[PDB]
């Protein structure tokens, strides 16, 4: 179908809670080669967030089970095989997205906000792949995640206000990457504190819509609190 039809089908699949369908629509749209508008970029993210998040959720449940199964190796065996199957679905999905990002979304992004958005997403997705990697490839997947976030972080520092939600959300996710994935709480705490403090100083300076910004500021501070004691 044409772009408009696809976009329409996508919104219909959203209403129906049929996310695999939504993702497939928004994949084709992306594949037409033209820079996505905010409505389209957002539909694509919603779709993939839910498609990937379900398999992350399922993975954590099964993986856990495979862990507390010190009893019957047998059961343990099944739990491992189920986990492996689910990791495989999960890797396929991240790989689709990571590829949509390298071929279209990053190169066609003409505006700082969108470019930071897609670099963050790249970091998010390499990070999801690190969560289920071992041990060989892990090092290199972790590095790709970090390179994305860093690059996104530099652009957001030059081009966006510290209270911009895309900037603060990058800070939130990057800081959690440092804490959970590089096991590096000093770097996590510092990034988060700085990001919080700089948004606080821009409040003194001053629109536009600080409700979302302040919720992300709260999430940053709740993490520092947790990570101190």
């Amino acid at each position: 179908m044409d772009k408009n039809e696809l976009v329409q089908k996508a919104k219909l699949a959203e209403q129906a809670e049929r996310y695999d369908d939504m993702a497939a629509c928004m994949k084709s749209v992306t594949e037409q080669g033209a820079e996505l508008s905010n409505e389209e970029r957002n539909l694509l993210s919603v779709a993939y967030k839910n498609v990937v998040g379900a398999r992350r959720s399922s993975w954590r449940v099964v993986s856990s089970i495979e862990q507390k199964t010190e009893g019957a190796e047998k059961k343990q065996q099944m739990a491992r095989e189920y986990r492996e199957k689910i990791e495989t679905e999960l890797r396929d999905i991240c790989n689709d997205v990571l590829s949509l990002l390298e071929k279209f979304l990053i190169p066609n992004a003409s505006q700082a906000e969108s470019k930071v958005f897609y670099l963050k997403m790249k970091g998010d997705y390499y990070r999801y792949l690190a969560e289920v990697a071992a041990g060989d490839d892990k090092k290199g997947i972790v590095d790709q995640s970090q390179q994305a976030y860093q690059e996104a972080f530099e652009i957001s520092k030059k081009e966006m206000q510290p209270t911009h939600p895309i900037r603060l959300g990058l800070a939130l996710n990057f800081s959690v990457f440092y804490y959970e994935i590089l096991n590096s709480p000093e770097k996590a705490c510092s990034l988060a504190k700085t990001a919080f403090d700089e948004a606080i100083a821009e409040l003194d300076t001053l629109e536009e819509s600080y409700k979302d910004s302040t919720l992300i500021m709260q999430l940053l501070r709740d993490n520092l609190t947790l990570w101190t004691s």
């Binding site: 993210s45 998010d124 939600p165 959300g169 979302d212 999430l219």
Partner: peptide, 10 residues
Amino acid sequence: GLLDXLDLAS
């Protein structure tokens, strides 16, 4: 709403 698409790690 907006924060949903942002896939926050919370």
